[PDB]
Swiss-Prot record, chain A:
Keywords: Acetylation, Cytoplasm, Nucleus, Phosphoprotein, Proteasome. The modification Phosphotyrosine is found at residues 2, 20, 72, 117. The 26S proteasome consists of a 20S proteasome core and two 19S regulatory subunits. The 20S proteasome core is a barrel-shaped complex made of 28 subunits that are arranged in four stacked rings. The two outer rings are each formed by seven alpha subunits, and the two inner rings are formed by seven beta subunits. The proteolytic activity is exerted by three beta-subunits PSMB5, PSMB6 and PSMB7. The modification Phosphoserine is found at residues 3, 10, 12. The gene is PSMA2. One of its GO terms (biological process) is response to virus. This is Proteasome subunit alpha type-2. It comes from Homo sapiens (Human). GO terms for cellular component: cytoplasm; cytosol; extracellular exosome; extracellular region; ficolin-1-rich granule lumen; nucleoplasm; nucleus; P-body. PROSITE patterns: PROTEASOME_ALPHA_1, PROTEASOME_ALPHA_2. Its main location: cytoplasm.
From Swiss-Prot, chain B:
It is found in: Cytoplasm; Nucleus. It holds the Pfam family Proteasome. Keywords: Acetylation, Cytoplasm, Host-virus interaction, Nucleus, Proteasome. The modification N-acetylmethionine is found at residue 1. It comes from Homo sapiens (Human). This is Proteasome subunit beta type-2. Gene3D superfamilies: Glutamine Phosphoribosylpyrophosphate, subunit 1, domain 1.
UniProtKB/Swiss-Prot annotation, chain E:
Induction: Down-regulated by antioxidants BO-653 and probucol. Keywords: Acetylation, Cytoplasm, Host-virus interaction, Nucleus, Phosphoprotein, Proteasome. This is Proteasome subunit alpha type-4. It holds the Pfam family Proteasome. PROSITE patterns: PROTEASOME_ALPHA_1, PROTEASOME_ALPHA_2.
From Swiss-Prot, chain F:
It is an enzyme of class 3 (hydrolase). Its main location: cytoplasm. Induction: Down-regulated by IFNG/IFN-gamma (at protein level). Induced in breast cancer tissue. Up-regulated by sulforaphane in breast cancer cells. This is Proteasome subunit beta type-5. The chain holds residues 60 to 260 of 263 of the full protein. One of its GO terms (biological process) is response to oxidative stress.
């Protein structure tokens, strides 16, 4: 293996491989996260290239524990590695403290793992950005993590293709008094903007987090919500 | 078996130790020194197994002096005692244990005099007077009987003389001479040897 | 681990990394050292002085032991490592031999350490140069100088840093037998040698003095001002 | 242009240039000749000196009581290989208590030498060897190249300007198997002399001889001891 | 492979180490951070670069010990690693000696790690610069500053980050040695920050202020609330409006 | 085995016997128990012969290397410290050795005692071996710091003879050495069977 | 201790006591010895308490990871495999004896695992100090394909015999019923023993204790 | 035995909205006294304490390592520790040294920093938690304390009666143990204050 | 860019050629072997009167019967000298006898090519070994390429060519040690830039029956009196 760093400083002080990884991320499928008073909603677009594909073979929304969930934007193969490591870290924390890991601690550990690949020998940075949702101490959380290793706490956010317009949409139509169902309606509407084709229950994925835990909605419920809208 | 004693007064610490180095049934040396100087105001007295004593004491001395030279100020007596205890405790369960019994005497410009006791299992205690050896049994009762917290230097030397005369009368081992030192705000002073 | 060869030979048999380390040293602040009869004197010129800075934290004269001290020129972070290696070696020597070190012993150790970094894999040379002063057990004063390449020499008086050539030219003329007969004369010689380079007078001078049985003493600004005023009064002749 | 700095790069024509440069290193050494009969094996070496005040470099080494070698190329590599050979012979004699056969030693040398020519940041051994030995199957002369390839010969010459000696040996191969020791030595001396410039001659100073045989351990003759072999020449 | 090696840890023909200057150039773009030392305390003031309306202790001030705090400028990802290392160094010292660590020892211990990366290993250096504030029984209230190359030094008033030179000149103009209190230090910090930011007027949401003081034999590290910064800004505005007359 | 060494105004004096036994069988009576480390240092053997010989050869080579590097001769305290540190790493393995180290240096004469348990003590009078308790009596009754050279020779010879008289594993011949400022010299090797007529009459 | 398990026509019934002793003195009177491993798999442990606790926690975390990755309910054979392999790796220094049981897509399964890595698959099992007194009841009164209530009564009788006939067992009885459609965790099921009522009044009136020093620390 | 080399006794008792923890004061080496004011109860928070009994070196080592870990945890998380989490942390720390165990048996007593609900528990040599509702004991005189507490403890004790009960139990229990005693220290942990008291006991 | 272990098209290692180039920048050392002993003489490059000449040592004692003179990059010779001393002491420890000059030279020169990618580059220092053993006085030469030879008279350094040319006519097999000392001093005077004045030169001899010896100021004055 190569023992030298492949990421180095530019004469203007920029780390360029990180910029290229962000360029890779900005070309992925859209994702939306909204935090309400009762829980968090994550939505993503799941358009596929052909009808021969099995729509239920792989999922973008995945549970880390009983109360934490992930979505991503970027490259799928890197997302799988990150998901595996996040699950292992949560299990280690549980083994030590006999208590479920809080969201803000999992985000920190995952961010440190993502940063290790920027200052290590012979490897390239991850090309994915992550949205994490959780429920702790009777209140919800929503975090974002970048390929560089920096994380932020948001109320509503959009990522992927055409995310500036998504952020403007969320800014104009967000207030702190939303219930979870109004949040789901707003998330689906935000995904509707800049969508290609006619959307059904088979080409979007939704996940919710509240007091009972994290769960991904079944296609029947997505059909109900789409009919309502 | 060697003998160590320490008495702690209002503004000084008095310490004493015997001067015999014995091998088998014969005395090899009669002016042995068992009092290591770790600083200008810290003394460390060590007894126990042959070999372990000098190795442990010289290791501690090197590390304390290195702290002084790196940082520009000296370790307080409490920190030196804690450092010594940690270093003995770590080696307790390894393949190279040290069999040593320790007294540490020091003076701090803010906390005053201090005297610390440590056995070979690395448990650290703070006492107003302490003793190590087989003469500890014969001496601690006299010290309990005649000691007061306000004792002065001359009275402390008289009390030490009482203890050593008791050792002369009752104890089976030949311990003719003792070395005595005192620690004060002016440093470490060597007093006259008590001999019989 | 990283096992690349950083410094290698070039055509005409030169080592370019060592030359660039020399170039790095030639940009530091000037340091002058003089060996008297019963006194040794070290002096450094402060490259930049600000009123918002604490001086105690930026001193460039360190004490390796109770009888050996040194001044450096070059990259500060490298010196902070070399000094802490030499301290540990001094303590180890005192423990094992039961005797304080010799100035030659410690300068030999430092030179060997600095030379071993120009022949290892994945390392770059130290960018510092050093003056080491002390007194031996027989009372003989000692002055030594160490190079980034690993060579060391003994000197009567010396200067390192930027502008060292001019100070050496001054010392070649003004170092005599009569000019070092007393401590005041030696200190004045060091100050005058520094004055050939430093600006704004004595406000930018750090001076240290060692004697036969005493520890290192840093001279306060008032003494420096007194000496500078005396040297100025000597110009009236 | 860019195919000649590493030993792990193939040229577009299917060649490795670093091996060829290591070959070029050998052809700059002084000449060496080896030849054998039905009963003996002989190595003849020509030594060189930097100046009239310097002694001539050694070229015949002891490897074991029945094995000797001769060198052409880099000296330190020769010393490394010679120490490896000595260790292998000692190990064989320790474990099985009989002399190591020569061919099984040459196989080990080739196996050792092939490894550097395949990995990154390593170089071939730039030394060529002539090996003379004797075992239960009779005399043996082996020749070794930097490319880890070895050959078994009837007679062979290596070094600078060694083509003339090769031509002489090719002309006179037929008499070798019947010659006795003295005639074989004189044949080797003539072949070695074929490489010298017309203004130089053989002398006791620059000629070394090594002989191994059926009832004769490997012996080396230098300086005055090579005078009997030179007497009667030409 | 020598082809792809970028040769991070080597000298340049002028005697320079280009990766270190590039890291320092990177730092000069981060948010402004300022530190002031007074007679009865010490303070840190930092600029908040997170101003999006949808964003949800403190953003750039970390607590390392019972007696110390720090603030970073540069790349936050490296700052997290360095902070996590500082905490472990302090805990190791306390475990060994049963006493809190002095400030200068902690700063030195981190700067050694920072220099080791620049001298060998083949990796890139850390692109962050730190300000440290603390209390110590040997020397009292102290303030320090570090660099990517491993250089540190004590100060009485300093500034790192964007527009550092103007802030340093203003501090040289206005700071009075030996006559500063917490109130005057807070006023000076507000004035310098207002004169440094690229905004018409300062706002309470764009700044965070932390104060270290020693009360009742214990150290208190307190982050000022918004309604106190608002009052400070109003006082500064009134004083400036009545300054010229 | 009995070896003694005492220090007086004109230097150090070392005396030893020569018998070596293996059980109740006397292997030899020509053993040389004063080991000649350098032209300026002396050591003795007691306990295991192999251990003493091996570790004092190691000490001699370290001393020579030190002298080559530092252009100065090693001192007695430093040599004893080196020997003490080389045998503390095999503590509990089963080594058995006890040695005096004798010399003269910048601080005058020097006489140190080092053994495998860990002791290292300076002194003015030492005796080691099985029959040392028999040599303390005579040596203590006769020793003074202002002795003359011949008187010190006589004292050492008498102490060793009295030790071998009552000890069963001690005997042979008495080998005597004198350490001065300009190196050591070998004084005599006297047979016990002749000291008997010299002393008794 | 006494732990027992039986297989009936629809699932598993497990039972244990609640006394924990240290030497010949009762330390805990309400210990819990039925451990969660998976929503369909449970374990009863005997032997050294710390070893059983750590072993079950580790295996539970590993099964959680495996089930998250695959997306299916775990199997009893998987847990049995990991338990027996880990126990054999340590050559018998972990004094844990385990009764493992669960229902999956194949049906009810019940295993017994020994400290050295052995394993038996059986229709009824007992372990502990009072294992023989309960095995007597199982040998006397077991029939294949019982109902739920009959199996619960049988397990209660076995545990009660172990409690009353052995000195190291006592206190209450805990039951856990695992079925394909549910999971019942009865805690406690029976209370065969009660503490007698106190006759005297030994309350210490205020001022009975003499005090040297006192300090108040207002938070 | 190794647990009896130094001696020692510690206990914890639960009342109504309050807890009490008591320990003896004596450091000696077998049958000889060395000191009296030895510390065995350490604070791990505003309203949380841990008491160690057993071998003195292990007592001090465990206390210092636990403080190390607790400080790091509280710095990362930004909140106070909970009694469940502290018990699990101590069990982990003790089990890590299986086959080489520390010779101590801790006792934990505190209040929930969110609801102020009492918590007392005890762990064994190798870290097996054992949570009770009435009282926990540890040390060389465990049988005497069990006997006294089974008879004196009653549910819903206010701070005064709880203090009297624990004082009487500890005094009468350590009066029958040769290598424990010579002073008793009692901490009463309550919602809004902590009360520390030293009792008058026999010194023989 | 190329590695440390690449051959040139005419079969030479580049790094060894560059090190041999670097050798030719050092001071001139001259060694002469006679039947009565061996002598070594070396220059000193005093760059300032403020330097102490006695701090420059280019002739060291490998052992009581073996001495060494060095040129090239001086700082690199310390490792070789240290190893030589260690090997001689190891040989004495194991076999209880003095090592041979040839064996010391082999042991030192076995480290020449032990570098790669531990050492990262060749040494670039040239050595002359002078000793007395069972065969008599012997002078050996060793260079950075790993080759060592035996010589009768050798000159290494920057002015090696003219010094060797002069040694060609000066040397003959029946020289006395005193004549050898005079001849070496004359050649050194010819090749130097400054004036030979018993302060900027260094001289040592090894003779049978007595140890390695370093000339002092008085002997230097007496010998230079004739020149």
């Amino acid at each position: 293996g190569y023992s030298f760093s492949l990421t180095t400083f530019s004469p203007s002080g920029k780390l360029v491989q990180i910029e290229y990884a962000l360029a890779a991320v900005a070309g992925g499928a859209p994702s939306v996260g909204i935090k309400a008073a009762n829980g968090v909603v994550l939505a993503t677009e799941k358009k596929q290239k052909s009808i021969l594909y099995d729509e239920r073979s792989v999922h973008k929304v995945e549970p880390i524990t009983k109360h934490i969930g992930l979505v991503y934007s970027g490259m799928g193969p890197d997302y799988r590695v990150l998901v595996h490591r996040a699950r292992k870290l949560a299990q280690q924390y549980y083994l030590v403290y006999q208590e479920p890991i809080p969201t803000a601690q999992l985000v920190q550990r995952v961010a440190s793992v993502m940063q290790e690949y920027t200052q290590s020998g012979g490897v390239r940075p991850f090309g994915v950005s992550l949205l994490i949702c959780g429920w702790n101490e009777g209140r919800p959380y929503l975090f974002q993590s970048d390929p560089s290793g920096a994380y932020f706490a948001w109320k509503a956010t959009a990522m992927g293709k055409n995310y500036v317009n998504g952020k403007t949409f969320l800014e104009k139509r967000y207030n702190e008094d939303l219930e979870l169902e109004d949040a789901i309606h707003t998330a689906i509407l935000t995904l509707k903007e800049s969508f290609e084709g006619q959307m059904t229950e088979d080409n979007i994925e939704v996940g919710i987090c509240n007091e009972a835990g994290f769960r991904r909605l079944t296609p029947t419920e997505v059909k109900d919500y789409l009919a309502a809208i | 078996m060697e003998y160590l004693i320490g008495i702690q007064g209002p503004d000084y610490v008095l310490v004493a130790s015997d001067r015999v180095a014995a091998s088998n049934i014969v005395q090899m040396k009669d002016d042995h020194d068992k009092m290591f100087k770790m600083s200008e105001k810290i003394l460390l007295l060590c007894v126990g197994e042959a070999g372990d004593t000098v190795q442990f004491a010289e290791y501690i001395q090197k590390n304390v002096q290195l702290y002084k030279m790196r940082n520009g100020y000296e370790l307080s007596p409490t920190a030196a005692a804690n450092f010594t205890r940690r270093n003995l405790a770590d080696c307790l369960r390894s393949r190279t244990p040290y069999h040593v019994n320790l007294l540490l005497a020091g003076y701090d410009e803010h906390e005053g005099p201090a005297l610390y006791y440590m056995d070979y299992l690395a448990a650290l205690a703070k006492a107003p007077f302490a003793a190590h050896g087989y003469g500890a049994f014969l001496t601690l009762s006299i010290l309990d009987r005649y000691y007061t917290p306000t004792i002065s230097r001359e009275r402390a030397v008289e009390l030490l003389r009482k203890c050593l005369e008791e050792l002369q009368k009752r104890f089976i081992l030949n311990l003719p001479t003792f070395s005595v030192r005192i620690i004060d705000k002016n440093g470490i002073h060597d007093l006259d040897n008590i001999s019989f | 681990s990283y096992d690349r060869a950083i410094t290698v030979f070039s055509p005409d048999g030169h080592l370019f990394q060592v030359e660039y380390a020399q170039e790095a040293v030639k940009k530091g602040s000037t340091a002058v050292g003089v060996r008297g009869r019963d006194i040794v004197v070290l002096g450094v010129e402060k490259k930049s002085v600000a009123k918002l800075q604490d001086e105690r934290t930026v001193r460039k004269i360190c004490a390796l032991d109770d009888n050996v001290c040194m001044a450096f020129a070059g990259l500060t972070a490298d010196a902070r490592i070399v000094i802490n290696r030499a301290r540990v070696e001094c303590q180890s020597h005192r423990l094992t031999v039961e005797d304080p070190v010799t100035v030659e012993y410690i300068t030999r150790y430092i030179a060997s350490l600095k030379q071993r970094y120009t022949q290892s894999n994945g390392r770059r040379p130290f960018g510092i140069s050093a003056l080491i002063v002390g007194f031996d057990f027989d009372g003989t004063p000692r002055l030594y100088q160490t190079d980034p390449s690993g060579t060391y020499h003994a000197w009567k008086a010396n200067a390192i840093g930027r502008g060292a050539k001019s100070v050496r030219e001054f010392l070649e003329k003004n170092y005599t037998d009569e000019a070092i007969e007393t401590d005041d004369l030696t200190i004045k010689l060091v100050i005058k040698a520094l004055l050939e380079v430093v600006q704004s007078g004595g406000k930018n001078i750090e001076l240290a003095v060692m004697r036969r049985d005493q520890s290192l003493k840093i001279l306060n600004p008032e003494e420096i001002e007194k000496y500078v005023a005396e040297i100025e009064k000597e110009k009236e002749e | 242009n860019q195919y000649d700095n590493d030993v792990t790069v193939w040229s577009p024509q299917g060649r490795i240039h670093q091996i060829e440069y290591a070959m070029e290193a050998v052809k700059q050494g002084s000449a060496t000749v080896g030849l054998k009969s039905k009963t003996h094996a002989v190595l003849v070496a020509l030594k060189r000196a930097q100046s009239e005040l310097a002694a001539h470099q050694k070229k015949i080494l002891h490897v074991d009581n029945h094995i000797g070698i001769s060198i052409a190329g880099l000296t330190a590599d020769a010393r490394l290989l010679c120490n490896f050979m000595r260790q292998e012979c000692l190990d064989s004699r320790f474990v099985f208590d009989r002399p190591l056969p020569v061919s099984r030693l040459v196989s080990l040398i080739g196996s050792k030498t092939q490894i550097p020519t395949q990995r990154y940041g390593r170089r071939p051994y730039g030394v060529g060897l002539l090996i003379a030995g004797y075992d239960d199957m009779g005399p043996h002369i082996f020749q070794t190249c930097p490319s880890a390839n070895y050959f078994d010969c009837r007679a062979m010459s290596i070094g600078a300007r060694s083509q003339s000696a090769r031509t002489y040996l090719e002309r006179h191969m037929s008499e070798f198997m019947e010659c006795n020791l003295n005639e074989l030595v004189k044949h080797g001396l003539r072949a070695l002399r074929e490489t010298l410039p017309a203004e130089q001659d053989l002398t006791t100073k620059n000629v070394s001889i090594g002989i191994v045989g059926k009832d004769l351990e490997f012996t080396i003759y230098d300086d005055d001891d090579v005078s009997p072999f030179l007497e009667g020449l030409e | 492979s020598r082809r792809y090696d970028s040769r991070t840890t080597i000298f340049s023909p002028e005697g320079r180490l280009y990766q270190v200057e590039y890291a320092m150039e990177a730092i000069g773009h981060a948010g402004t951070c300022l530190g002031i030392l007074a007679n009865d305390g010490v303070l840190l003031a930092a600029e908040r670069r997170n101003i999006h309306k949808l964003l949800d202790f403190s953003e750039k001030i970390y607590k390392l010990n019972e007696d110390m705090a720090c603030s970073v400028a540069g790349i936050t990802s490296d700052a997290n690693v360095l902070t996590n290392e500082l905490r472990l160094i302090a805990q190791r010292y306390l475990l060994q000696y049963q006493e809190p660590i002095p400030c200068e020892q902690l700063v030195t211990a981190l700067c050694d790690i920072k220099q080791a990366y620049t001298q060998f290993g083949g990796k890139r250096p850390f692109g962050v610069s730190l300000l440290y504030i603390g209390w110590d029984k040997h020397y009292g209230f102290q303030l320090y500053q570090s660099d990517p190359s491993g250089n540190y030094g004590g100060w009485k008033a300093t500034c790192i980050g964007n527009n550092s030179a103007a802030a340093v000149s203003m501090l040289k103009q206005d700071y009075k040695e030996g006559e500063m209190t917490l109130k005057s230090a807070l006023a000076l910090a507000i004035k310098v920050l207002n004169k440094t930011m690229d905004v018409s007027k300062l706002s309470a949401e764009k700044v965070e202020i932390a104060t270290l003081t020693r009360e009742n034999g214990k150290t208190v590290i307190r982050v000022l609330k918004q309604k106190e910064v608002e009052q400070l800004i109003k006082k500064h505005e009134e004083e400036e409006a009545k300054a010229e007359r | 085995t009995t070896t003694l060494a005492f220090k007086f105004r004109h230097g150090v004096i070392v005396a030893a016997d020569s018998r070596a036994t293996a059980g109740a069988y006397i292997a030899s009576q020509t053993v040389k128990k004063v080991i000649e480390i350098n032209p300026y240092l002396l050591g003795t053997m007691a306990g295991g012969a192999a251990d003493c010989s091996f570790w004092e050869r190691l000490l001699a080579r370290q001393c020579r290397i030190y002298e080559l590097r530092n252009k100065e001769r090693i001192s007695v305290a430093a040599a004893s410290k080196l020997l003490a540190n080389m045998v503390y790493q095999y503590k509990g393995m089963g080594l058995s050795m006890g040695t005096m180290i004798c010399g003269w240096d910048k601080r005058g004469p020097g006489l140190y005692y080092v053994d495998s348990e860990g002791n290292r003590i300076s002194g003015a009078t030492f005796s080691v071996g099985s029959g040392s308790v028999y040599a303390y009596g005579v040596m203590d009754r006769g020793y003074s710091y202002d002795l003359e050279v011949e008187q010190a020779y006589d004292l050492a010879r008498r102490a060793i003879y009295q030790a071998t008289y009552r000890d069963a594993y001690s005997g042979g011949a008495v080998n005597l050495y004198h350490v001065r400022e300009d190196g050591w010299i070998r004084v005599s090797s006297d047979n016990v069977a002749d000291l008997h007529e010299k002393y008794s009459g | 201790t006494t732990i027992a398990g039986v297989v009936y026509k629809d699932g598993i019934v497990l039972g244990a006591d609640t006394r924990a002793t240290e030497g010949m003195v009762v330390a805990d009177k309400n210990c819990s010895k039925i451990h969660f491993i998976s929503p369909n798999i449970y374990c009863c442990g005997a032997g050294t308490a710390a070893d059983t606790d750590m072993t079950t926690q580790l295996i539970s975390s590993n099964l959680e990871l495996h089930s998250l990755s695959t997306g299916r309910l775990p199997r009893v054979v998987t847990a049995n495999r990991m338990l027996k392999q880990m126990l054999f790796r340590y050559q018998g220094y972990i004094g844990a004896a385990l009764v493992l049981g669960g229902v999956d897509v194949t049906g009810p399964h019940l295993y017994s695992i020994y400290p050295h890595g052995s394993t038996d698959k059986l229709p009824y099992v007992t372990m502990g100090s009072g294992s023989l007194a309960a095995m007597a009841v199982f040998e006397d009164k077991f029939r294949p394909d019982m109902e739920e209530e009959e199996a619960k009564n049988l397990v209660s009788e076995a545990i009660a015999a172990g409690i009353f006939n052995d000195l190291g067992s006592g206190s209450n009885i805990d039951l856990c019923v695992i079925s394909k459609n549910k999971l019942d965790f009865l805690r406690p099921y029976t209370v065969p023993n009660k503490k007698g009522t106190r006759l005297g009044r030994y309350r210490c009136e205020k001022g009975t204790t003499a005090v040297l020093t006192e300090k108040i620390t207002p938070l | 035995s190794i647990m009896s080399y130094n001696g020692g006794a510690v206990m914890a008792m639960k009342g109504k909205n309050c807890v009490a923890i008591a320990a003896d004061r004596r450091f000696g080496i077998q049958a000889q006294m060395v000191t009296t004011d030895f510390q065995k109860i350490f604070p791990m928070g505003d309203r949380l304490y841990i008491g160690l009994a057993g071998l003195a070196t292990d007592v001090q080592t465990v206390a210092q390592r636990l403080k190390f870990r607790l400080n790091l945890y509280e710095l990362k998380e930004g909140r106070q520790i909970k009694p469940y989490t502290l018990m699990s942390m101590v069990a982990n720390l003790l089990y890590e040294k299986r086959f080489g165990p520390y010779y101590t048996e801790p006792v934990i007593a505190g209040l929930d920093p969110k609801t102020f609900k009492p918590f007392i528990c005890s762990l064994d040599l190798i870290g097996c938690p054992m949570v009770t509702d009435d009282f926990v004991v540890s040390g060389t005189c465990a049988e005497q304390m069990y006997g006294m507490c089974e008879s004196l403890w009653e549910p819903n004790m206010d701070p005064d009666h709880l203090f009297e009960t624990i004082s009487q139990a500890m005094l009468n229990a350590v009066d029958r143990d040769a290598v424990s005693g010579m002073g008793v220290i009692v901490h009463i942990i309550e919602k809004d204050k902590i009360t520390t008291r030293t009792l008058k006991a026999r010194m023989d | 860019d190329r590695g440390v272990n690449t051959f040139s098209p005419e079969g030479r290692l580049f790094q060894v050629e560059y090190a041999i180039e670097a050798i030719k920048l050092g001071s001139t050392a001259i060694g002469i072997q006679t039947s009565e002993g061996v002598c070594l003489a070396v220059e000193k490059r005093i760059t300032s009167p403020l330097m102490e000449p006695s701090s420059i040592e280019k002739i060291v004692e490998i052992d009581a019967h073996i001495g060494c003179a060095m040129s090239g990059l001086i700082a690199d010779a310390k490792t070789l000298i240290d190893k030589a001393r260690v090997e001689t002491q190891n040989h004495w420890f194991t076999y209880n006898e003095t090592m041979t000059v040839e064996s010391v030279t082999q042991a030192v020169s076995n480290l020449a090519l032990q570098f790669g990618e531990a050492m990262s580059r060749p040494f670039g220092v040239a050595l002359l070994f002078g000793g007395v053993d069972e065969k008599g006085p012997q002078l050996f030469h060793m260079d950075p390429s790993g080759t060592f030879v035996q010589c009768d008279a050798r000159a290494i350094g920057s002015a090696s060519e003219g010094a060797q040319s002069s040694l060609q006519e000066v040397y003959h097999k029946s020289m006395t040690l005193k004549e050898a000392i005079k001849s070496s001093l004359i050649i050194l005077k010819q090749v130097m830039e400054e004036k030979l004045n018993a302060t900027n030169i260094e001289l040592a001899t090894v003779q049978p029956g007595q140890n390695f010896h370093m000339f002092t100021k008085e002997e230097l004055e007496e010998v230079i009196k004739d020149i």
